[PDB]
């Protein structure tokens, strides 16, 4: 049973390069295509290139030709992907995979690495600020309110409402990486407007990377 | 498993001294590791159904057949969608997804046969989907 | 290059229905096609290799077919766990190993217009020199929706970002947030902040507004 183990999560500044490793154990790549695949958050799979022993060559997709270098080292059973001139749009999950294609007919025993997250940002670790999204004075008896979790790095944050007692109607959106290199996300909930006087609504935010916590009461504005 | 694959036997050679026509070769893989290959050949006005069971070894692409007495090495060609089978008489065969000859595949197959010390006058087999006595 | 087209790119069905997914190569590629399943936030899962062979453990309801240019993944009868994105890919000893663009298999439901909500920047935030204005489009279907910001009736461009939820497990809707980010200086130059929403379920565009300063 062959396993591929990739190097861990990387944060790189725009303009730098990242070199991700992929170590094979229980086997090698000498007879099998070793490929690199990426996926930008919420988007699709893209083949970047690979080492193709049958033709004795490394080949790249057009999109990445000239900006990615794929190599392997026999003695260490390790393959590498180096991506230069990083921009924020190279923020993605990168995977290596060994394709079971050597036999004329086989069992399809492809092996993927676990993935490596690369985040392209100039930012340092930073806990969030949390601002209220206050319920409007003005709807089927329901009101929308929320919290804006702004200016944290890196991923992830967690958000609950009322210490987890409030779950119905909650939507916590995927984070966006802003041009500052910091993340922002919003969490909202719809509640009975009759409740707004009486029931407290507090968002509980946790950013483990910074060991920070914020709890923000959200109420109608005076 | 019961995984399957379809192919054409396009050319053959050996270190010694021939189907008039061949049908496609069909491979079936069985839970356990073995492959079974089937092809029909027109020879002496008769249609022969050939079956070979290739038994797993610990090495990928290497099988045993004919009650242990034959060893068979199967490897992809550099030319897209072709494979080369080597057997030890000592023989080599060119398989492709496409029934029509690829000159590139044939050229590579010649160089392969030379490395193995096989007769370099390659026999190209005519193809037909069905066998007509 | 070789391109793999997956069309339609969305299918809306339900447990019990057959799903037929298409993958068309831009030129012949024999049997060198794989299919993957991928759920949100998870690793891709190999279903089919060599166009017609199931990977190990894959249930029998999944079958692949085709050779040449036109490939098909059929799920004979969808189960709940089968709603996901499906990708085809060239898979072979020889390059290229291009992926298709993906077909999302989602749960069908009736058209539902968004409930729209606009949220002014907090005083606390404003102090720091930046204003975030948030527009929420809640519980709509299908996913296509256009949000436009207008400030004193001028259409904004370049200063907003959108984020969307995964389909809700209970009601099969989507929600979306749009955030307009301004400097305090720019925020303070205008009066009317409006979020204008267009969606299949709305017969006219819906606008929510406030005037800067309650
Ligand atoms: Cl099933």
Numbering used by the authors:
A (entry chain C): 1 to 138, 141 to 224
B (entry chain A): 11 to 27, 31 to 101, 109 to 153
C (entry chain B): 1 to 214
The authors write:
Eight dog (Canis familiaris) allergens are included in the World Health Organization and International Union of Immunological Societies Allergen Nomenclature database, among which Can f 1 is a major allergen (Pomés et al., 2018; Schou et al., 1991). Like most mammalian respiratory allergens, Can f 1 belongs to the lipocalin protein family (Flower, 1996; Virtanen et al., 2012). Lipocalins share low sequence identity but have conserved structural motifs, characterized by an N‐terminal 310 helix, a C‐terminal α helix, and a central calyx formed by two antiparallel β‐sheets that enclose a central hydrophobic cavity forming a β‐barrel for ligand binding (Dartt, 2011). In summary, the structures of Can f 1‐hIgE Fab complexes revealed two unique and partially overlapping epitopes on Can f 1.
The complex of rCan f 1‐12F3 Fab crystallized in the P21 space group and diffracted to 1.8 Å resolution. The rCan f 1‐12F3 Fab complex reveals a large interface area of 1102 Å2 (Gao et al., 2020), of which 62% is contributed by the heavy chain and 38% is contributed by the light chain of the Fab. The interface displays a binding interaction between HCDR‐3 and rCan f 1 residues, in which the HCDR‐3 loop comprising residues Glu103, Ile104, and Leu105 inserts inside the β‐barrel of Can f 1 and makes non‐covalent interactions with the rCan f 1 residues Trp17, Leu40, Leu48, Tyr76, Ile87, and Tyr96. Crystal lattice contacts are not observed in the epitope‐paratope region. The hIgE mAb 12F3 showed an unusual mode of binding by protruding its heavy chain CDR3 inside the Can f 1 calyx. Only when complexed with 12F3 does the N‐terminus of rCan f 1 have a different conformation. In contrast, the complex rCan f 1‐12F3 Fab proved to be an exception in that the unique IgE epitope was located inside the β‐barrel of Can f 1.
